[PDB]
């Protein structure tokens, strides 16, 4: 529709791409190198909380979370990952996930494509797959 939608937007969606393909994704709490602690909102309730609350205050990260020096350093976004388990709920940096627009659907539907099944197989398929792993 517009050019906006290619922006994250603090309860739009993401598309966040793992490698072999791509899963939805909806941001509540951020990220930015210019003080390396983040900012949330009420836009979900994660696996662990009661729920985000109003306008979280800046703290220092680390409480349930990990974020490595790649992602520290830029903007970063943690995320439900939708029609998926809150096991998954982390934060991704901006070379993985993008807000949703129509760039990223172009990814999602070539994906869809290529690389569109389960994985339930002993080989993992091109899927997260978290029924077992080592």
């Known amino acids: 529709m517009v050019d906006l939608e ?19 994704a909806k941001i509540l709490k951020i990220w930015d190198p ?6 949330s909102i009420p836009n979900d309730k994660p696996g662990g909380s009661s729920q985000a609350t109003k ?11 990990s974020i490595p020096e790649e992602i520290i ?15 998954w709920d982390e ?3 901006y070379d993985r996930i993008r807000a949703y627009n129509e760039e ?3 990814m999602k539907k070539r994906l869809a494509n290529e690389a569109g099944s389960t994985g339930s197989a002993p080989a ?3 899927v997260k797959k978290p029924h077992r792993y080592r």
């Open 6 to 24: 290619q922006e994250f937007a603090l309860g739009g969606r993401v598309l966040a791409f793992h490698g072999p393909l791509m899963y939805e």
């Open 55 to 65: 306008e979280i205050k800046p703290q220092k990260l680390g409480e349930d979370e």
């Open 104 to 106: 990223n659907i172009a």
């Open 91 to 93: 934060w991704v940096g």
């Open 34 to 39: 210019s003080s390396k602690m983040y900012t």
């Open 124 to 126: 993992t398929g091109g």
């Open 73 to 87: 350093n830029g903007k970063s976004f943690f995320i439900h990952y939708q029609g998926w388990k809150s096991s």
